[PDB]
Symmetry: C2
Amino acid sequence: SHMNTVFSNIANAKITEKSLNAVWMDLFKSADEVLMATGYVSNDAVVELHKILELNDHIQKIDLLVGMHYLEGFSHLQYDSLCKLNDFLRHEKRGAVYVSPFVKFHGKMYSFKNYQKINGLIGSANLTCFWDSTERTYETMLHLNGKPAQILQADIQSTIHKLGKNIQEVERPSKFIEHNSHLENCLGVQKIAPEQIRQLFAQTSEYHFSIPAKTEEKSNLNVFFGEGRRDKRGFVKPRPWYEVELIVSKDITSQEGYPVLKSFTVITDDGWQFQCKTSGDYSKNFRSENDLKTLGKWIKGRLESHGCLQNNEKITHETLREYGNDHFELRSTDNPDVWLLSFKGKN
Amino acid sequence: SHMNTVFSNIANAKITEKSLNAVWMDLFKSADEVLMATGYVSNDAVVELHKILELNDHIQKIDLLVGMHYLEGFSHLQYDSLCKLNDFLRHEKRGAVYVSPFVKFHGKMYSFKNYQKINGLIGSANLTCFWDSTERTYETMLHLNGKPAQILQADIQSTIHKLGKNIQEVERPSKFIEHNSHLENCLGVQKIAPEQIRQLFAQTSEYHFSIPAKTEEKSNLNVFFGEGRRDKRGFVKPRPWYEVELIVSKDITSQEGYPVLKSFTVITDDGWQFQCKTSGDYSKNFRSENDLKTLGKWIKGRLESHGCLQNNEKITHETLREYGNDHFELRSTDNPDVWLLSFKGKN
């Protein structure tokens, strides 16, 4: 009773009464102090947590132990985002980010302090965008309340004291693991071998469109910098880092052969397959269909991998210039339901 | 209470009363039925679990869900080991191995039944050689007994029923990911960049020894096939797959410059650094000092990555012939405490 199983409950495998992301967010929203211990983190999870703490004053203290990365390997984007979060927390005296220099720490544990009420979660789930309602992996946690949660809270605190070192206080890693956007973890995404891609892109297309990468500061590709959504309790959530809005002008959607108001398969020059869909006024909105984030991860992830885009940064005319491309190429195949999409850099 | 936190308690961070590997083994040893759900597995963990069930009759039923690999990627060795385990379980009517074809299942959950008494673990730890007393990562679990353990057991059962498909019943994976021995997860191992290695091995050595890869069937490199360890109760553990005994003849250790009865740094042709140690009569025994398994993982993992050695297989001279090498090269540097160790195949 002081214990409840809490699973992801996706994929027609609804096992537990409540689902992970909703429970985590519920506990996070009402808490005034949080302890987090994770094995891994992603750049967007960290950057978005950072904005969330910027946008909501409810968390008075937050401590985050990142356990695996110091010894196993950081991307520069992960490392810098954590440093940047730490800077904020320190300057606002709202807590700290720790790494684990003495051991590869793999635990996933969360404690939420609401006044005198304590809730805990412990299981498989690393720190992700729990504030994204789309769950992509099936995780299993155990929710604790009352006195057992109190015990877990102290054990998390002990972990931080004995294993954790303020990330500010450690030597910045000499070598980084290269940035991996992990597009394969987006829902509805397949990898296509380079040989298939070569043969598939060899063909000549009947229809060919060149769609501008837009450079608006707070919308389109940069909606991340636009206004966040406020929930009923007043919690403000930023728009996701890997969400873009690809909005195609009438000048193009009106052209012969354009896939208007249609679902279709897209295959990318760098070997990814996923369903997209056009919709809205003048069929302007071009979207990845199974996962909101696929299209944005494809676009921003490529920019990030070339070193043209980093944390918390707007795509500008200069981003595209340095990358070597300012358009997305959308062209047909002999199949009216399969299209090719390219965003090749100068390399 | 019906709950206890159970952590690894390594790296001078002893936080919980009992430590993970010891608790898991204790519960495993007392059980007549086990339910296991994991995100990941390694080839040796599966092969050794398989050997454990071969050697001990106490487990009447075991169900094993492997959650991540089917959709994310199998190595041939992981896939083959699980299939062989399933084959055994099917033939003995002692349970089954499941994969997760419909979702990337990442949970880590274990349920142990002793008569009618149920014990459970839920947290961060994937299936490893829990029967190896050395923990290499700091993991965090929550132990359940009584009615809460009963609940977790039912939820594990549901997970298997809703997500699991018998590995016998799924299409063989189209592509395998390359075998990764993950030597970096051995204690006391550092990685050296290919550029430094190239410069380091360019030097000429004053001392040069060529150490035969021995082909004894049940000892030396093949101690895995030797006798296992029996504890007080008669529970049999096989000798670890990645344990080898590198035994060097008097003809070699008696030679000028051989590192007798001393610890020294070893750097390998494929970019790994770790301390080794010579000991015993005539400095006969050559060992990884910080982690018993490093040397065997280095030697066998290379044979495995080339496809010259497979699951549950003894190293023979034909293994070595197919590989293209039957000797380990140990030669000096200008530092008498730093040595070069090579095992290149024809490749």
